[PDB]
Design a protein around this ligand. Structure first.
Ligand SMILES: OC[C@H]1O[C@@H](O[C@@H]2[C@H](O)[C@H](O[C@@H]3[C@H](O)[C@H](O)O[C@H](CO)[C@H]3O)O[C@H](CO)[C@H]2O)[C@@H](O)[C@@H](O)[C@@H]1O
Ligand SMILES: OC[C@H]1O[C@@H](O[C@@H]2[C@H](O)[C@H](O[C@@H]3[C@H](O)[C@H](O)O[C@H](CO)[C@H]3O)O[C@H](CO)[C@H]2O)[C@@H](O)[C@@H](O)[C@@H]1O
Length: 373
């Protein structure tokens, strides 16, 4: 089947362009939605950094004029981009490999531009869209509504959220001297374009860890946590009725019943939720993966010392206390109504509300993606 895609600028003045980029269902061929409603399946270019040969910028009707409504074909790994004023320069690399705007890299053609995107996937099973602040918040927050079986709505960042986030993070940086302010991205004019999560600022330095921003943010805290659980159990409720597993630190290995082992994490690990003890590994049993998720989340939320049993029994009010925490997540959460701010933010105490920015429907009829308010 196909879904109807509605692109809408609710209030921003002037012209906003949307791009819809994805991997075609089955073929895996990068596809872009075109302004005319057709799909542009690029061929592999003759060189890297080959400008997208077709203009796939979809011009949005003016603020309030209603949506651009096209047919959304099924595609995965898909994005709806929005960009204000300008268009976005997409390139092609041999493959074809779409060169997506790199929100976090300053050399990027689009870096100085005001642009955002949300991720979605539309396959025969469901349209699954995701508002997510794991990586960045921008000056062009996206909201969505998915109409199918049910109506699902994800509230955007409110107007001005990215400025608030940038200011809070700069304030944080003033207090702790950590590079939170460097997560902020602004053009020559002064307006905040985006703020990126620490991992996106840290990954350029992954090859040179001794210069990585934030590298020692969590180091002291991690040592305190590892020391705590040398002498007392860490109980992680796997939830879903799977029960808790009790863990202890032996040397630098946090070991849970079931022999699930977690080496001592680094600030990098906590931020990426994907290195050190939080490195994904298909060999990991479900229990290990559940443990992994909850331990990463608990470190990000800085509840490892305060809550030897988690996530059940903790609440959001326990998160992000003290000087050393994932202030990106704290600040994003402060400044956003819904949506995750770090990779294991989906870890939530039972009975706490789902705060994912996800919208999914098994029979999507219209996927309204909007900027403005
Ligand atoms: O948000 C910034 C990050 O975007 C990343 O890209 C994501 C990612 O590629 C994602 O893949 C999903 C799953 O990992 C898996 O491939 O299956 C689902 C179903 O298709 C995928 O959606 O796809 C989204 C687009 O929906 C895409 O944005 C990376 O490029 C990161 O480098 C980047 O920080
Ligand atoms: O949030 C930023 C991060 O985006 C990530 O990718 C997400 C995610 O993987 C998601 O998967 C979907 C569901 O989990 C679902 O069960 O299955 C559907 C397919 O039917 C999946 O779509 O999908 C969203 C949107 O496609 C996707 O962005 C990561 O890839 C990270 O790299 C990134 O930081």
């Amino acid at each position: 089947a196909t879904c109807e895609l509605a692109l809408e600028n609710k209030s921003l003045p002037g012209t906003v362009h949307a791009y819809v980029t994805g991997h075609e269902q089955g073929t895996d061929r990068w596809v872009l939605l075109r302004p005319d409603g057709s799909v542009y399946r690029p061929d592999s270019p003759g060189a890297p950094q080959t400008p997208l040969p077709v203009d796939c910028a979809i011009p949005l009707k003016g603020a309030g004029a209603g949506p651009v409504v096209m047919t959304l074909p099924q595609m995965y790994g898909a994005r709806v981009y929005f960009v204000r004023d300008d268009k976005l320069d997409f390139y092609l690399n041999p493959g074809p490999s779409l060169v997506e705007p790199a929100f976090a890299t300053p050399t990027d053609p689009n870096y100085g531009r005001t642009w955002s995107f949300c991720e979605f996937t539309f396959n025969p099973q469901q349209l699954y869209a995701n508002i997510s602040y794991v990586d960045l918040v921008t000056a062009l927050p996206i909201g969505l509504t998915l109409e199918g079986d049910s109506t699902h709505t994800v509230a955007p960042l409110p107007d001005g959220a990215v400025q608030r986030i940038a200011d809070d993070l700069t304030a944080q940086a003033a207090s702790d001297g950590q590079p939170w302010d460097k997560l902020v991205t602004r053009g020559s004019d002064g307006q905040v374009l985006r703020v990126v999560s620490p991992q996106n600022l840290m990954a350029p330095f992954f090859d040179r860890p001794d210069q990585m921003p934030f590298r020692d943010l969590f180091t002291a805290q991690i040592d305190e946590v590892w020391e705590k659980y040398r002498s007392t159990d860490l109980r992680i409720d796997l939830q879903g009725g799977r029960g808790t597993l009790s863990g202890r630190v032996s040397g630098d290995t946090l070991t849970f019943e079931g022999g699930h082992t977690f080496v001592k994490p680094t600030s990098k690990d906590i931020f990426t939720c994907n290195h050190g003890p939080f490195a994904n590994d298909p060999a990991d049993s479900d229990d290990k993966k559940a443990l992994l998720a909850r331990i990463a989340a608990g470190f990000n939320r800085s509840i490892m010392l305060s809550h030897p049993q988690q996530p059940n029994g903790t609440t959001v009010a326990d998160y992000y206390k003290g000087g050393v925490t994932n202030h990106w997540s704290r600040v994003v959460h402060a400044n956003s109504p819904i949506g995750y701010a770090f990779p294991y933010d989906d870890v939530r105490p039972d009975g706490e509300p789902d705060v994912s920015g996800a919208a999914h429907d098994g029979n999507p009829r219209r996927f309204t993606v909007s900027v403005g308010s």
